[PDB]
Amino acid sequence: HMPLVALLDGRDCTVEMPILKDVATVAFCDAQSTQEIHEKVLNEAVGALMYHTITLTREDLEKFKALRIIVRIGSGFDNIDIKSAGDLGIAVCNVPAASVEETADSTLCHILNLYRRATWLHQALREGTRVQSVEQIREVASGAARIRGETLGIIGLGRTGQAVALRAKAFGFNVLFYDPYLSDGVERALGLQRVSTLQDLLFHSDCVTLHCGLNEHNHHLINDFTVKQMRQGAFLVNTARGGLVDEKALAQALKEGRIRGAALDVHESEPFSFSQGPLKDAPNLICTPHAAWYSEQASIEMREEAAREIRRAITGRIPDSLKNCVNKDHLT
Amino acid sequence: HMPLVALLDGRDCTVEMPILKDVATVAFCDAQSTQEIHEKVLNEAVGALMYHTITLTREDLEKFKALRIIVRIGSGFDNIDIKSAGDLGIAVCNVPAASVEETADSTLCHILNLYRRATWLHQALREGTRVQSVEQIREVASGAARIRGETLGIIGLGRTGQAVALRAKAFGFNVLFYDPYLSDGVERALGLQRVSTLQDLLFHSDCVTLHCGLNEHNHHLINDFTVKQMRQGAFLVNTARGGLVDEKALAQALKEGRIRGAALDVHESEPFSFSQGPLKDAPNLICTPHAAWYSEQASIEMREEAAREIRRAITGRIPDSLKNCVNKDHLT
Ligand SMILES: Nc1ncnc2c1ncn2[C@@H]1O[C@H](COP(=O)(O)O)[C@@H](O)[C@H]1O
Ligand SMILES: Nc1ncnc2c1ncn2[C@@H]1O[C@H](COP(=O)(O)O)[C@@H](O)[C@H]1O
Ligand SMILES: [Ca+2]
Numbered sequence: 134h135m136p137l138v139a140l141l142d143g144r145d146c147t148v149e150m151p152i153l154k155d156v157a158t159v160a161f162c163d164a165q166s167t168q169e170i171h172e173k174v175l176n177e178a179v180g181a182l183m184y185h186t187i188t189l190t191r192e193d194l195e196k197f198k199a200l201r202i203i204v205r206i207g208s209g210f211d212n213i214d215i216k217s218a219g220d221l222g223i224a225v226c227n228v229p230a231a232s233v234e235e236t237a238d239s240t241l242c243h244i245l246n247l248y249r250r251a252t253w254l255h256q257a258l259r260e261g262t263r264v265q266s267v268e269q270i271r272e273v274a275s276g277a278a279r280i281r282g283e284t285l286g287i288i289g290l291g292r293t294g295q296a297v298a299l300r301a302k303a304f305g306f307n308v309l310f311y312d313p314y315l316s317d318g319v320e321r322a323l324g325l326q327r328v329s330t331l332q333d334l335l336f337h338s339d340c341v342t343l344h345c346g347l348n349e350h351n352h353h354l355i356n357d358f359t360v361k362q363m364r365q366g367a368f369l370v371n372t373a374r375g376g377l378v379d380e381k382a383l384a385q386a387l388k389e390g391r392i393r394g395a396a397l398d399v400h401e402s403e404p405f406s407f408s409q410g411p412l413k414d415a416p417n418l419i420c421t422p423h424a425a426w427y428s429e430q431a432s433i434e435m436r437e438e439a440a441r442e443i444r445r446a447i448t449g450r451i452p453d454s455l456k457n458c459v460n461k462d463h464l465t
Numbered sequence: 466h467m468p469l470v471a472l473l474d475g476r477d478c479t480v481e482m483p484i485l486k487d488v489a490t491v492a493f494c495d496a497q498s499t500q501e502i503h504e505k506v507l508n509e510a511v512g513a514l515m516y517h518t519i520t521l522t523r524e525d526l527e528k529f530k531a532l533r534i535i536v537r538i539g540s541g542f543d544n545i546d547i548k549s550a551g552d553l554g555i556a557v558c559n560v561p562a563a564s565v566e567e568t569a570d571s572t573l574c575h576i577l578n579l580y581r582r583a584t585w586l587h588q589a590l591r592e593g594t595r596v597q598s599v600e601q602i603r604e605v606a607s608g609a610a611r612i613r614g615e616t617l618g619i620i621g622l623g624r625t626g627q628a629v630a631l632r633a634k635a636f637g638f639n640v641l642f643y644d645p646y647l648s649d650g651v652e653r654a655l656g657l658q659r660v661s662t663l664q665d666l667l668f669h670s671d672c673v674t675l676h677c678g679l680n681e682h683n684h685h686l687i688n689d690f691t692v693k694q695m696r697q698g699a700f701l702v703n704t705a706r707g708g709l710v711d712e713k714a715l716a717q718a719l720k721e722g723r724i725r726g727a728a729l730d731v732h733e734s735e736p737f738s739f740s741q742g743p744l745k746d747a748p749n750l751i752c753t754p755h756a757a758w759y760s761e762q763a764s765i766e767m768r769e770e771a772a773r774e775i776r777r778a779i780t781g782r783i784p785d786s787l788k789n790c791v792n793k794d795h796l797t
């Protein structure tokens with residue numbers, strides 16, 4: 134028979150089937166954890182596809198007896214211990230290009246929703262507020278600010294971050310970015326301003342947007358300490374990873390007014406709920422259910438790419454034939 | 466005594482007082498119609514300031530016995546019969562520059578809210594929807610589309626329209642515009658594509674945004690007939706004037722799905738209410754309470770400019786000293 138490939142945290146395999154039909158047997162688990170995956174998959178699965186709703190620890194990885202390649206249908210892979218996976222001889226890949234501009238457009242929409250209060254204005258109308266006079270327009274829309282001259286601070290000037298910077302300049306934003314891993318001069322190529330420390334970024338930014346990956350060194354990057362370094366009444370946007378922000382510190386900052394508003398597509402604990410979590414009673418909050426990446430074309434694009442990567446690993450040499458393996462250094 | 470200047474449809478005069486203290490007596494009416502204005506104002510008012518919530522017909526204008534200048538605190542003046550005002554010897558001015566970029570940023574936010582469904586996703590979370598799996602993310606966010614390659618059609622390429630076009634290009638939009646009054650070649654200067662007829666604009670546009678003024682020739686520009694010329698599942702955005710769209714025709718188009726969604730900051734009858742009007746049961750609708758213009762700096766900027774214009778008219782020669790009079794042709 135063919136090698137077994139399993140969709141860990143999902144059920145739909147329609148897009149991947151035409152690409153893997155003659156290369157592997159495809160099954161799905163629809164499991165939120167390794168405890169929900171049948172022994173057959175853990176015993177015989179040679180490849181694996183997964184999104185962001187299941188975590189793979191070293192303990193989880195050790196339970197796979199034949200897994201040779203994990204392909205994350207998406208850009209982020211913080212939910213996988215790529216180091217231990219490489220130790221166990223498991224290559225890990227991702228799909229980084231499918232949702233770059235989708236996430237940037239969602240970020241700009243979140244930024245504009247804070248500066249223009251469009252979402253809150255709409256919600257006020259749905260709740261029955263009557264805005265007849267100009268005085269009432271100013272009151273209901275109180276907080277909407279002029280964008281030109283404002284400083285947008287970008288943390289992580291990667292593919293998505295660069296797309297955010299290019300769009301932000303079209304609105305008159307003055308864009309700063311902090312990225313301690315980029316080579317010297319990337320700010321000159323894109324006509325941006327760069328700072329060397331996170332504190333400098335937070336000190337000068339009227340609006341801070343996160344576009345870095347979650348790694349072992351930037352967990353709770355926005356914490357009670359760094360939150361005190363942000364400008365009075367600053368904006369916070371996060372379409373990256375919920376693990377980057379201490380919602381406990383963010384919640385208090387919103388209540389006290391030190392942060393005028395926050396737009397979040399990712400949270401420390403998902404799915405997100407307005408009735409649970411540290412943000413239970415936090416005001417001036419816009420939240421989306423981790424959908425900044427999604428478009429019909431982006432969804433199909435990343436699923437087909439991931440399928441081909443699984444194919445290359447089963448019919449080629451690992452990791453030589455892999456196109457987007459993220460743990461070649463750790464791979465044994 | 467000094468000449469009397471009256472704030473027709475408002476109450477707050479704090480910003481204008483320091484500019485007019487030694488030039489005119491300032492009073493406010495806070496009236497939605499001429500029927501609520503005291504006889505003293507109609508008899509002695511030499512100047513008048515007004516926003517968009519009161520209409521001035523020829524019948525209304527004839528009731529002023531000493532009015533010599535009307536200054537609209539804003540860009541649009543469709544709520545005034547400038548032709549009859551000029552006939553009666555009444556100069557009419559506006560403030561066109563204060564909210565150009567504010568309105569453009571609100572427009573882009575409305576456009577992004579349609580393509581990214583950020584507002585609807587937020588509202589779904591506030592209503593309690595649980596989005597745990599990727600399949601549920603696609604379902605709840607169903608309709609979010611990739612922006613690059615889409616065609617944004619602009620109706621009216623004025624100051625705001627041009628600002629919208631410049632921003633729209635940063636997202637990968639291919640921008641078309643229809644403006645039968647612009648001189649030949651304005652499309653080359655700004656690197657845009659131009660069409661000659663409204664039908665051509667609607668035929669090619671995936672998203673149609675209105676940025677023209679309401680005049681005697683474009684009332685119900687979007688009607689049951691022209692709505693049938695728009696692409697299947699097109700987007701409609703209106704931060705211009707509610708009188709440009711036939712909400713009856715728009716309502717049915719949304720229900721039948723011929724229009725995938727509409728974002729409206731202006732309506733045929735304001736204040737807008739989700740329980741009254743032709744849009745009572747229309748789906749896929751985003752509405753803001755005529756606040757696309759508002760920012761703290763823009764509000765102060767236009768009020769101070771309008772005050773100086775009233776000053777120039779009282780201490781100078783009409784309409785020679787006026788900076789933004791819009792009816793010099795009709796002025797006797
Ligand atoms: N702690 C951090 N602070 C700022 N930027 C970071 C941090 N960690 C990673 N990055 C950057 O974030 C960017 C993300 O890349 P991309 O995968 O293209 O979105 C890269 O340029 C990284 O160097
Ligand atoms: N019916 C119409 N269709 C398209 N454009 C129009 C129409 N009426 C006026 N405009 C244009 O809309 C623009 C508005 O100018 P502005 O005052 O700068 O926003 C001007 O360029 C007008 O020529
Ligand atoms: Ca501020």
Ligand SMILES: [Ca+2]
Pocket residue numbers: 610671697698
């Ligand atoms: Ca379409």
Ligand SMILES: [Cl-]
Pocket residue numbers: 184185206207599
């Ligand atoms: Cl995902």
Ligand SMILES: [Cl-]
Pocket residue numbers: 277278279760761762763
């Ligand atoms: Cl402001």
Ligand SMILES: [Cl-]
Pocket residue numbers: 148429432433436
């Ligand atoms: Cl899909």
Ligand SMILES: [Cl-]
Pocket residue numbers: 267516517538539
């Ligand atoms: Cl106004």
Ligand SMILES: [Cl-]
Pocket residue numbers: 428429430431609610611
């Ligand atoms: Cl799409």
Ligand SMILES: [Cl-]
Pocket residue numbers: 480761764765768
């Ligand atoms: Cl004001």
